[PDB]
């Protein structure tokens, strides 16, 4: 069962936001160098497949340079039941968009703490003001939580508005979506790239965005930009089916 956490997540009372309830985001992955340094996030979407951002892989096209950590809450002192799986192959999206698939060397073991996220239907458009969640271990910019998995609940901003001069001034593609608090203070940041933007739909969480870029982090009128997963579901499914 994708999208349904065994440990239920909690809202807040990553810059700002709050520390997640441990293991409430069981599809969250830590992308690390073959030396063990965290540098990006990802999302488990099936036992053998992780979705991340293509820019997270710019340094090396060799699958050997990457390892995936699953089931973690601490970033440094990894808990014992954490799964560390090597990457067997890399699939960059073929039209140069900021999304990529990692095929794991072995299927992740599905547990209470490691569960895949669900994928959306093709071309679904998250509606304006939908409150979704972003998660990760990235920079906190003096906001507490460093070293622990953090979350933030952010409203989606429809592309027609996000592209106005007052916000991102024509920079956002239809294959991307915008989310964030326009007053600033809470945002994904460096170290969170490649990680998930999930939305609650009926009874489970659906992966709708991949953390990609922004004009800074948590600045006023500068919401984060995410790859719009629904525009790549058909590609993703074809890669999994044929590999
Ligand atoms: N929730 C906020 C947030 C969350 C998580 C993060 C981590 N992710 C990054 O770090 C990305 C990495 C990256 C690089 C290239 C790329 C995609 C992602 N895609 C192409 O290469 C594809 C080719 N074209 C690129 C241009 N595009 C036109 C629209 C446009 O201009 N897109 C920008 C893209 C990158 C930047 C700026 C603009 C540069 C920097 N932004 S930054 O202001 O300098 C900065 C951010 C954070 C901290 C600091 Cl200190 C500085 C920036 O985000 N890099 C069309 C396609 C950051 C922000």
CB burial of 18-31 (b: ≥16 within 10 Å; e: otherwise) equals bbbbebbbbbbbbb
Atom of ligand 1 nearest to the CA of 223: 1
The approach used to solve this structure was X-ray
Residues 6 or more apart from 28 whose CB is under 8 A from it? 41, 43, 72, 135, 136, 149, 195, 196
Distance CA 125, CA 100 (A): 20
Pocket of ligand 1, candidates 155, 214, 218, 220: which has the most ligand atoms within 8 Å of its Cβ, to mutate? 214
Domain 28-116+232-242 shares a fold with domain 118-230 = yes
Domain 118-230, what architecture?
A: Beta Barrel (2.40)
For 5-46, the DSSP string reads: -SS-------BSSEEPPTTSSTTEEEEEETT--EEEEEEEEE
Atom of ligand 1 lying closest to residue 225 CA: 1
Cα separation, 42 vs 68, whole angstroms: 9
Tokens of residue 147, six digits: 């070293």
CA nearest ligand 1 atom 8, residue: 213
Task: Enumerate the domain spans of the chain.
Answer: 28-116+232-242, 118-230
User: How far from 95 is each of 69, 81, 98, 99, 122, CA to CA, in Å?
Assistant: 28, 38, 9, 10, 17
CA of 193 to the centre of ligand 1 (A): 10
Task: Phi first, then psi: give them for residue 117, nearest 5 degrees.
Answer: -80, 160
Q: Residue 113: count other Cβ atoms within 10 Å of its Cβ.
A: 22
Instruction: Name residues contacting ligand 1 (CB within 6 A).
Output: 55, 98, 171, 187-190, 192-193, 211-217, 224
Tokens 């669900």 correspond to 118
d(CA 155, CA 130): 5
Q: Record the resolution, in angstroms.
A: 1.6
- Alpha-carbon gap, residue 213 to 201, rounded angstroms: 25
Distances (CA, A) of 137 to 14, 39, 74, 184, 201: 7, 9, 9, 19, 25
Ligand 1 center from residue 228 Cα (angstroms): 15
How many angstroms separate the Cα of 13 from the Cα of each of 19, 25, 112, 142, 143? 10, 18, 25, 18, 14
Between CA 237 and CA 225 the distance in angstroms is: 23
Helices marked H in 153-206 — which ranges? Answer: 159-162
> CA of 205: how far to CAs of 39, 131, 145, in Å?
24, 12, 23
Q: At 191, list the tokens.
A: 């170290």
Give 181 Cα–ligand 1 centroid separation in angstroms: 18
- CATH class of the 28-116+232-242 domain in this structure: mainly beta
């Amino acid at each position: 069962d994708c999208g349904k956490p065994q440990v239920e997540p909690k809202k807040c009372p990553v810059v700002g936001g709050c520390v997640a309830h441990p293991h409430s985001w069981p599809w969250q992955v830590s992308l690390r160098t073959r030396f063990g340094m965290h540098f990006c996030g990802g999302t488990l979407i099936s036992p053998e497949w992780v979705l991340t951002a293509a820019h997270c892989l710019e340094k090396s096209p060799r699958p050997s340079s990457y390892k995936v950590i699953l089931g973690a809450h601490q970033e440094v002192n990894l808990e014992p039941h954490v799964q560390e799986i090597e990457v067997s192959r890399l699939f960059l999206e073929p039209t140069r968009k900021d999304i990529a698939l990692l095929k794991l060397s072995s299927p992740a073991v599905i547990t209470d703490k490691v569960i895949p996220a669900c994928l959306p239907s093709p071309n679904y458009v998250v509606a304006d003001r939908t409150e979704c969640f972003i998660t990760g271990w990235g920079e906190t910019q003096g906001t507490f939580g460093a070293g622990l998995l953090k979350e933030a609940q952010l409203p989606v901003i429809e592309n027609k508005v996000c592209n106005r001069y007052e916000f991102l001034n024509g920079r956002v593609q239809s294959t991307e979506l915008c989310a964030g608090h326009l007053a600033g203070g809470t945002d994904s940041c460096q170290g969170d790239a490649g990680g998930p933007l999930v939305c609650f739909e009926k009874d489970k969480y659906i992966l709708q965005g991949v953390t990609s870029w922004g004009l800074g982090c948590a600045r006023p009128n500068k919401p984060g930009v995410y790859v719009r997963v629904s525009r790549f579901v058909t590609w993703i499914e074809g890669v999994m089916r044929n590999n």
